[PDB]
Structure 1
């Protein structure tokens, strides 16, 4: 129903929405913005609390579309989480965490979202030169001014996280985590759990690989970055496909699909309070929410844990 996100006062439905496909034209071709707006709208309608966006998502367009749909509802009923770090250069970006850039980022985010505040603001990526506790202190200024209500870091190393949380101002960590890449459990979970930092994973389905989207006979076109991901190369691809299918029975048992079981597993981790599955259309959102109805047995959780053991 409602999960508290770590040290913050954020109460959210365990299934949030990823908005990279809402006006994220730089990421996807032929996006229909009205479809994106309708998806966001549907999400809020269906009880989703958290909308996860970022500056890179359409260079601000994602925040803009979300901002338009927001006028339709009550601001206090939605948790807006956005990020910044990408600094435009030469048709490419460089990460910037300097105080001046982060504060500017917040003010520009607020204008694009057309709102008085942002619930959760992230440092999307770490830059290589700014002391991370100073970057966070900069965001902390906007927090004190009431412009953001919580701060988070993303894609930080344990060391950079420690530095950023030097004064305990980091409430959320968003990192890459899935059944094929469980490193966070050893490298981050201990610390986050300790310091009551909520952990939000991304890339939980590994491009559909862990969602039953393919078969062992699936093939991709030359140049497709997928048949170059690694978990897709050589015997790794077939191996993971054949390994994911071993979850079919559990899915059947709970009357859902493999992706629902996979995600429910992540949610079952004491260290994770919410997921941010993506979507292009409203209907897809309604299918993501079903994950929240799943309750795996300790027996199911253990099997999956062993089945997807690192080594």
Structure 2
């Protein structure tokens, strides 16, 4: 019912909620803000502990909406993770990890969330010129003052992570990882496991491909982002569909669906304590809570590992 996130003292239910569809108007068209608030409220009512947001989600709006729902509950019963790096420049953004920028971003995030502390604060993307250990040290000043309780980094290369953890202050790393892109096992995993840094994957279901939602005849409307990715093209796509479908007997056996088996396999890794699947509505997040009750056998884990062995 509760996992400890690496070196941090954060205790959380193993399925968290990603909030980029709660007020993220710069990312999605036609979003309903009350639908987003009900998603956050129902996640908390159903036992999800961690809410993962970011400044770029709606350019502050996701954090403001989450903050409004937070008023309805007890602050200490929830774990809030948020992130910063995007800095407005012209009509887009550039990344900034400078000490003063990160500290000011933490202050502005607390105001949007309308709360006095953040549980986990991430450097969302690495900038080019700031030495990463100084960027992390700036967040540690906020940790010392009680404004944040843990520090994370995301989208950092292994060398950037080592510089950032120079003094051992990084508690969590968010990075791309899934059954079709398992490169993190060779690079990051040995390092995060050794240092007790919690690893949270992003893109765990490959835009639905690993959820067994498509067939080899599936096509997507023009302009659809899936059409651009190689996992979704030619014979590779058909090969991907055939392997995912071989997961159906394991899902039937555990009385869940294919995505629940894939997400449970990530949680069985010693390096991973929590998953943050996304959702647009309360009902979709509730379907992903089922994942937590799955107990894969060692034979299930080994079979999936070999079935999805790197090509």
Shorter-normalised TM-score: what interval? over 0.9
**Number of the residue aligned with 2:282:** 282
Q: Deviations over 1:200-222 (max 9, x none)?
A: 00100000011012111111122
* Secondary structure in 2 matching 1:167: coil
RMSD (Å), alpha carbons: 0.7
| Residue 237 (structure 1) shift | 1.2
- Partners of 1:33 and 1:236 lie apart in 2 by 38
How many positions carry a matched residue from both structures? 311
- Partners of 1:305 and 1:134 lie apart in 2 by 39
| Residue 184 (structure 1) shift | 0.7
| Residue 235 (structure 1) shift | 1.1
- Partners of 2:203 and 2:277 lie apart in 1 by 8
* Secondary structure in 2 matching 1:174: strand
| Residue 225 (structure 1) shift | 1.9
| Residue 37 (structure 1) shift | 0.4
**Number of the residue aligned with 1:265:** 265
Q: Deviations over 1:64-93 (max 9, x none)?
A: 000000000000000000000111112221
| Residue 252 (structure 1) shift | 0.5
Gaps of 5+ in 1: none
Compare 86-95 and 160-169 and name the one that shifted more: 86-95
Compare 289-298 and 222-231 and name the one that shifted more: 222-231
Compare 112-121 and 24-33 and name the one that shifted more: 24-33
* Secondary structure in 2 matching 1:279: coil
| Residue 40 (structure 1) shift | 0.3
**Number of the residue aligned with 1:231:** 231
- Partners of 1:37 and 1:249 lie apart in 2 by 36
- Partners of 2:111 and 2:215 lie apart in 1 by 45
| Residue 233 (structure 1) shift | 1.4
* Secondary structure in 1 matching 2:271: coil
| Residue 243 (structure 1) shift | 1.1
**Number of the residue aligned with 2:113:** 113
- Partners of 1:223 and 1:16 lie apart in 2 by 30
- Partners of 1:56 and 1:213 lie apart in 2 by 29
**Number of the residue aligned with 2:140:** 140
TM-score between both structures, scaled by the size of structure 2:
0.99
Q: Deviations over 1:102-125 (max 9, x none)?
A: 011100100000000000000000
TM-score between both structures, scaled by the size of structure 1:
0.99
* Secondary structure in 2 matching 1:170: coil
Compare 83-92 and 98-107 and name the one that shifted more: 83-92
- Partners of 1:75 and 1:223 lie apart in 2 by 41
Segments of 4+ moved more than 3 angstroms: none
Q: Deviations over 1:146-202 (max 9, x none)?
A: 100000000101100000000000000001110000011111010000000000001
Compare 86-95 and 269-278 and name the one that shifted more: 86-95
After TM superposition, list the pairs within 5 Å mapping 1:1-311 onto structure 2.
1-311=1-311
Compare 110-119 and 234-243 and name the one that shifted more: 234-243
| Residue 8 (structure 1) shift | 0.6
- Partners of 2:26 and 2:216 lie apart in 1 by 31
Q: Deviations over 1:266-310 (max 9, x none)?
A: 000000000000011111111110000101110000000000001
